[PDB]
Amino acid sequence: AAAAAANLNAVRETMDVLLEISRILNTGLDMETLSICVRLCEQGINPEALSSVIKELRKATEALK
């Protein structure tokens, strides 16, 4: 109806401003992988572990390339 569409606008707004904070901090993420990371951080997860996960997968993608 209406309240199911206002939330869609209010989540497009935050997924844009989080991308802006991502690009001034020069993180290598894009719009698609950031939507995975914010979803993971919603349920409650250690950022010190998930950041180590990403810093290992991005270090192992170069040995295969």
């Binding site: 206002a6 869609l8 606008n9 989540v11 497009r12 997924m15 939507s35």
Partner: peptide
């Protein structure tokens, strides 16, 4: 799924008598 719907086509309309959430 919701971030997949979030990639939609937005309406860039606005009025002066509609300030809060007016697409």
């Amino acid at each position: 799924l919701w971030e997949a719907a979030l990639t939609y086509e937005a309406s860039k309309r606005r009025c002066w008598e509609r300030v809060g959430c007016p697409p």
